[PDB]
C-alpha cells in the first residue's frame, strides 16, 4: 500500500495474506475473508499458479514476520477464476478460493459482507523499490472513489466498464499496488463493512490523477453465490 500507514492487530480481520510456497514461501496477494471457506481475490494473482497445492492462506496476520513454520494456515482446495476472466485491464478480475478446512472465526479473522460510497479503506502488503521486497506490517490507507465517468476520462485508450470502480486521490500519493493486488477495498456504510472493490490494476502507483482500478465487486454478487454454497 503506497503512502499509507501501519495497521494494528485485530483491525482488518477480513484481510488475509495469500502465500505461494514454491519455490520459496512468500506473500503473493491480498484476499478478503467472505465466508467459512471463501476468500475473494483477484484473478491475475494466479498468473501461472497451475495448482492450488502451493497456496496457503494465513489469517489474523499483521507483521509478515509473524508467520513461522508452525503457524496455522488454510490450504486451498479449488481455484475458481471467473469464466470470462482473460486479462485484468479488461475486467472480470475476480477469483475465489475454496479452502481445505473452514475458519473457526475469532475477532481478528471474521468475514466481511458484500454491497448492493464514502468511508473506504484499501489494505495490503505490497512492494518496494529494492530487492522486490514485501512490506512487513500490514498497511492501510483511506481513499475516496472516482466516478467511472471521471476515471474513464483519465484512461483515454483503455475501457473502464460498469464492472469497474476507481479510487485514488486527485493530488495522488495514496494507492494499492502489486502485492496489495487482490486485497480489499472495504467501505463502512451505515456503520457496516462491505467489500466494494478488489485491487486489480493501474498505471503507475499513487500517481497524481491516475487512480487505481478495482474490480467493482457490487456487479458480481450473483456470480459469487452461484458458489458460496
Amino acid at each position: 500500500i503506497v503512502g499509507g500507514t501501519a495497521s494494528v492487530r485485530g483491525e482488518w480481520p477480513w484481510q488475509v495474506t495469500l502465500h505461494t510456497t514454491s519455490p520459496t514461501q512468500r506473500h503473493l496477494c491480498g484476499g478478503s475473508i467472505i465466508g467459512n471457506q471463501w476468500i475473494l481475490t483477484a484473478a491475475h494473482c494466479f498468473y501461472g499458479v497451475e495448482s492450488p497445492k502451493i497456496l496457503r492462506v494465513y489469517s489474523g496476520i499483521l507483521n509478515q514476520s509473524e508467520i513461522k513454520e508452525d503457524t496455522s494456515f488454510f490450504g486451498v482446495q479449488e481455484i475458481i477464476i471467473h469464466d470470462q476472466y482473460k486479462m485484468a485491464e479488461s475486467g472480470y478480475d475476480i477469483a475465489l478460493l475454496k479452502l481445505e478446512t473452514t475458519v473457526n472465526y475469532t475477532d481478528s479473522q471474521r468475514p466481511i459482507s458484500l454491497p448492493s460510497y464514502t468511508d473506504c479503506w484499501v489494505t495490503g502488503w505490497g512492494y518496494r523499490k529494492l530487492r522486490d521486497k514485501i512490506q512487513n506490517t500490514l498497511q492501510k490507507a483511506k481513499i475516496p472513489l472516482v466516478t467511472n465517468e471521471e476515471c474513464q476520462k483519465r484512461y483515454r485508450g483503455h475501457k473502464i466498464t460498469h464492472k469497474m470502480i476507481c479510487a485514488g486521490y486527485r493530488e495522488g500519493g495514496k494507492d494499492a499496488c502489486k502485492g496489495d493486488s487482490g486485497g480489499p477495498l472495504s467501505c463502512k456504510h451505515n456503520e457496516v463493512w462491505h467489500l466494494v472493490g478488489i485491487t486489480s490494476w493501474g498505471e503507475g502507483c499513487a500517481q497524481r490523477e491516475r487512480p487505481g482500478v478495482y474490480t467493482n465487486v457490487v456487479e458480481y454478487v450473483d456470480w459469487i453465490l452461484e458458489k458460496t454454497q
Epitope: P23, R26, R131, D132, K133, I134, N136
Partner: antibody, heavy 120, light 108 residues
C-alpha cells in the same frame, strides 16, 4: 542448516586479480539477493556489491565499480566476486551475505569471511 | 548518497544498566534501518530490522526505535555476553551504508 562458505582469499600483488567464491547451503539460493560486505583490518563494515536472485540487477560501491564484478550461478549454488586492479584499500575480510527474507532487505546470513591481503 | 552517523564511538557500562546507541541518517530513510552485533572473533549478526523489528532468537533486552532520520538502539539490561561492536545500516537505497560502529564494553 543455513550456511555460506567463502573461499579464494589470500595474498595478491597490487594490480592483481582474485575470484572469491561462496558456497551456499541449506536454502533455496535462487530466490535470494546476495551481497558482499567486507571489513578492512580494524574494522568498519563496508558494503561492496549485490546482485538479485536471478543474476540480473547488479550494483556496486563507487570504490570498486569498474574493478569488481559480482555474479552467481544458481545451478551450482555459488556466488562470486571477481576482483581486479586490486589496491591496498581492498585488504579486508570478505563476507558473503544473504540479503534477507521476503519482507526486509538486510544481511540475515553471513559466512565466516575470507581474508584478502593486497601487498607486494 | 546517504551517510550514517553513529554515536557514541565506544562506551562502558556496568552489567544491568540501560545502554543506548544512536544513528542519524543524512536523509529520510523512513524505517529502512537495520542493527548488527559483532562479537569479538565472530561475524556480525543481524539483531534488528526495519528500525525496531527484532529477529528470531534475539533476546528481549534488545530493541530499537526511530524513523526518518533519528534512530536508537537500546539494551534494557546489559549483559557480559553483549560485549561487541554494534553497527547501523540503511537499507533505503544503494549504496548500502553503515555507521562507524559503537564499541560496547563492560565495567566490573
Amino acid at each position: 542448516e543455513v550456511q555460506l562458505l567463502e573461499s579464494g582469499g589470500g595474498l595478491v600483488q597490487p594490480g592483481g586479480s582474485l575470484r572469491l567464491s561462496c558456497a551456499a547451503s541449506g536454502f533455496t539460493f535462487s530466490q535470494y539477493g546476495m551481497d558482499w560486505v567486507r571489513q578492512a583490518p580494524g574494522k568498519g563494515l563496508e558494503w561492496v556489491s549485490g546482485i538479485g536472485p536471478s543474476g540480473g540487477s547488479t550494483v556496486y560501491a563507487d570504490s570498486v565499480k569498474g574493478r569488481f564484478t559480482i555474479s552467481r550461478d544458481n545451478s551450482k549454488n555459488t556466488l562470486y566476486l571477481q576482483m581486479n586492479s586490486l589496491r591496498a584499500e581492498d585488504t579486508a575480510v570478505y563476507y558473503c551475505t544473504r540479503g534477507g527474507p521476503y519482507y526486509y532487505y538486510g544481511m540475515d546470513v553471513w559466512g565466516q569471511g575470507t581474508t584478502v591481503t593486497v601487498s607486494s | 548518497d546517504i551517510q550514517m552517523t553513529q554515536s557514541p564511538s565506544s562506551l562502558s557500562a556496568s552489567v544491568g544498566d540501560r545502554v543506548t546507541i544512536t544513528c542519524q541518517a543524512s536523509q529520510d530513510i523512513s524505517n529502512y534501518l537495520n542493527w548488527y552485533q559483532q562479537k569479538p572473533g565472530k561475524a556480525p549478526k543481524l539483531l534488528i530490522y526495519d528500525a525496531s523489528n527484532l529477529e528470531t532468537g534475539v533476546p528481549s533486552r534488545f530493541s530499537g526505535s526511530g524513523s526518518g532520520t533519528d534512530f536508537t538502539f537500546t539494551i534494557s539490561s546489559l549483559q557480559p555476553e553483549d560485549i561487541a561492536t554494534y553497527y547501523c545500516q540503511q537499507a533505503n537505497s544503494f549504496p548500502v551504508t553503515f555507521g562507524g560502529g559503537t564499541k560496547v564494553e563492560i565495567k566490573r
